[model samples]
Target: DLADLFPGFGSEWINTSSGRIFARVGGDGPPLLLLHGFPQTHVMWHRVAPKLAERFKVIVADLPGYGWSDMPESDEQHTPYTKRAMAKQLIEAMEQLGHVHFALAGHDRGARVSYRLALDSPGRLSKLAVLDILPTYEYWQRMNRAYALKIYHWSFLAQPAPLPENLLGGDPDFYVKAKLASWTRAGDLSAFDPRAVEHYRIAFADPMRRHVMCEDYRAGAYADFEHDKIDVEAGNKIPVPMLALWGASGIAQSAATPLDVWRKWASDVQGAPIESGHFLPEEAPDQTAEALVRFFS
Candidate 1:
C-alpha cells in the first residue's frame, strides 16, 4: 500500500528492544529521518519525500504505536508512549540503519518526538524541523476555551483508558474523518489523496490501534509534560539549529507565531508560515520541501 504511495521506495521492518518499527528508506545522500504525525503514517511524506530525496537520503518511519509499528503495552503512567520512549526508538532505528547522526523533521506528534530526541541526544542530530505545534508545556499552560474547542481530543483521549477507547469505538470511521476535516483550514478532506485517506481509515479502524492512539495522548498530557518541565527547569534546550513551520491559516497562528514560541527553547531558531492549514506536507508539499531542504542543507 505504502509502496504504491511512495513509488521506487523500499520498505523494511526494523527490530529493536523496544519493538519492531515499520519504515521506508530511499533516496541517496546525507541521511534524514522523516517522522509523521498522529492518525497518519509515514505516508504523510509521500509528496515531499521524493522531492527531498533529490538532495538527501530520506527515512520515514511510523512512530511507535502508529501505522504498522509495534504497539507495546502501556502502563498507568503511559511510559511506553512518551516522546522520550518514542525518541529512543527512532534513535535505535536510525543507528541500525548505519546513521549515527542525521537531520530530522517531523509533523504534529512526530514533531514532539523530534523535539524530545533533539533534547535527549543533541549530539546525534545535525538539524531539526518541527511542524504545526507548540511545546507540550506551553499548550497546557495557555489552553483556554478556544484552544480546548479546537483540540478537545487531547483531553478526551487522555482520559483513563477504556473510556476513550469505548467512546471512540462507537463510530471509528466518522471520528477519523471528522478529525482529518476539522484540523484543516478548509474544514474539508479535499487536501488528502483518496488512497492516503483510506490507509489512515484502515489503520485507525483497528481497536488495538485506537487504544494505542489514546495512549499517545495520555503520555503527552502526563509523562511527556513532566519530562519537559524537568528539562526546562534545568535549562536544557535543543542545541541543534532548529526550524519551526506552521500553517499560516491554522489554529497555531492564532496565538503566537511558531518562531516566537520556539526561540525560548532553542538558541538558533528560525522559521516562517506555509500558506496552508495544519497539513502542510500534504497541502503544500513544494513549499514544505523547499523550506526543509533549505534549512537542512
Candidate 2:
C-alpha cells in the first residue's frame, strides 16, 4: 500500500556510527527529509510526502531502533539514543544517501531531533520545519503542574533502568495503540487509512523496536537536557529560514509568538497554527501539505 504512496521510489539501507537507517527517495529536484515522531514510522508521512515529491526529492526514513531501523542492544548503547546523536547519525545517513544539503520537516519526536540537527549542522539544512513540539529545554523549564500532567508520558517513559522497558515490553501493542488512540481529539483516528494503521502495528512487531521507542523519551528526560544545555551555553543557532507549525486542539498548544523560543537559535523565524491536533499530517493532510509546500516554495 505504501508503495503506492511514492510511485517508483527506491529505498537504501544506510549505516551510521550509531546504527543502521533505511531511507526512501523519490522525485527529483532540491531535497527534503520528512521525519516522523513517536509510535509512528516514516510511514506517518506517506500521504503528504508524495505530494511534495512531485517537484522535490523527498527522503523519508525510519529512525534507528524504530520502524525498520536497527534497535539498540543494551542500556550501555542506549546513550546514543540522545536526540543530538540521532540527529548527527541522520545527517550522516543523508550524506551517505547522496544528499549534500536539504530542507527538513519533522513531527513530534522528529521535530525535537530536527531542532538538534539545525544546531549541530547549520549549513546542512536550507530550511527547517518543527511540527507540534516546543524546544526540549523550553519544555523542561516549563514543566509545571498543568503542562506536566498533560505530557505525563515524558516523565513516565523516562523512568530509570529497566522500569519503562519492562512495563512497556509486557504489552507493547497496548502501549503503542493506547498512545495512538488517546493522543487525538474525538473522531480523528477515523481519518487515518486502515492500512496505515496496520503498518504501524507491523513496524513495531519487534520487541527491540519497543525498547528503542521507550529509550527516545528516556533520553529526552535525561541526556537530551545536557545536549540542549551545551548548545544554549555555546549560543548555537539555526541560521536558516524556519517555520514552526502547531495544531490548535486540546493540550497540543500553539504559540502566538511562535519564533520566540526559536529566536534563541535562529536569526529569522516564522510560524502559525494549523487547525488540527497532534496528528496534523494524517488528520489534516491537505492543510499540512499546503502549508509546507508554501513554506518551502
Candidate 3:
C-alpha cells in the first residue's frame, strides 16, 4: 500500500542534516520537488506527479512529522519544527538526492516551507509554486473575525502542549477526515483517493505524530512568524519566479486578492484560482497539472 499512490516511483529514506527524510522519486529531466501539506502526506501529489513526471524528474516527499519522515525532538522554542529548520533540511535532502537546485511546489504547510526556503536559500529554487496558502505573516496580520473563524486551527493547533494533541489524538480518524472534508469545495472526502486517505489516517492515529503536528503549529505561531516578520519589516522578498495558485473556494481565497498579497512578497509572480478547493492535486488534478507544467516549463 505504501507504493499505491505512486506507481513505478522509487522510494528511499535519505538521512538529511535534519533527520531521515522519506521520499518518492520518479520521472526525468530537470528536478521538481512536490511537497504535501498538513494532515496529508506526499500522497497528496499522487495525481499531479504522474503528469509532471512526463517532462520533469519529480520528487515527492513527506515533510517531517507528516508522513514516513522522522519527528525530531523540539526545543522550548519549537525551533526544530520551524519552517526554517524544515526548509534547510529539505534543501540538504534534495541536494543529496542529486540536485543542488530544483523547482518546488508546495501546498498548505509545505507551501509555507517552500517560500521560507526560497527566501532563505536564495538561488536554490529555480521557481516556487505555492498552493492554496497566503504568507504566514500575512495570515496573522489579516486575522479578523471572519478569517479567524475560517482558520481557527492556526490558533487551536498552536495551543500549549497536550491540548490540541490530546483532543485530536483521541479521535484522530474523525478529526482528520472532517478536516480534509471541510477544506474541500465539495464538503466531503470524495476528492481524496482512498489510499491517500488511509495514509493520512494511519499517521494521524499516532499520538507522537499528533504531538509533532502541534509543534509544527507552535513553531508557526512563534518562530515561523518571527522569521516572516523580520523579512516583512526588512522588505526582503523572494528572488526567484513565483507562482501562486489558490483554489477558487479554498482558504487562501478568503484573503485579499491572492496575487496582490503575493506580489508584496515576490517579484516575478503570476497565478490564478483552480476550479476546486484546497486539495487541488486530488480535487482538480488536470487544471493543477496544466498550471504547474506551463509555469514550470
List TM-scores for all candidates, in order: 0.98, 0.92, 0.98
lDDT of 1: 0.89
Better of 1 and 2 by TM-score: 1
Every candidate's lDDT: 0.89, 0.79, 0.91
- Which runs in model 3 stand beyond 4 Å of their true positions? 1-3
How do the residues 1-297 of candidate 2 rate in per-residue lDDT, one tens digit apiece? 443455578886888877788777787889998889888988888888888888788888887777877775646535768888888889988888778689999998888889888887878998999887777887787788977887888898887757877887788777777777676654336767667777787766676676677788888987788788887888877788898887776234634344567777677788777777678788778888988999988
Count of backbone collisions within predicted model 2 = 1
lDDT of candidate 1 over 1-297, digit per residue (tens): 433688878898988888999988889999999999878888989999998888888998998999999998888988889999999988998888899899999999999999999999999999999998878987887789987987888899999979999999999999988888887878899999888898889899999999999999999899999998988899888889999999987546775687887888998989889988889998889999999999998
Error at 53, model 3, angstroms: 0.6
Error of 1 at 22 (Å): 0.6
| Ordering by TM-score | 3, 1, 2
Alpha carbon deviation, residue 248, candidate 3 (Å): 0.8
Better of 2 and 3 by lDDT: 3
- What is candidate 1's CA lDDT for residue 220? 87
TM-score of 1: 0.98
- Who wins the lDDT comparison? 3
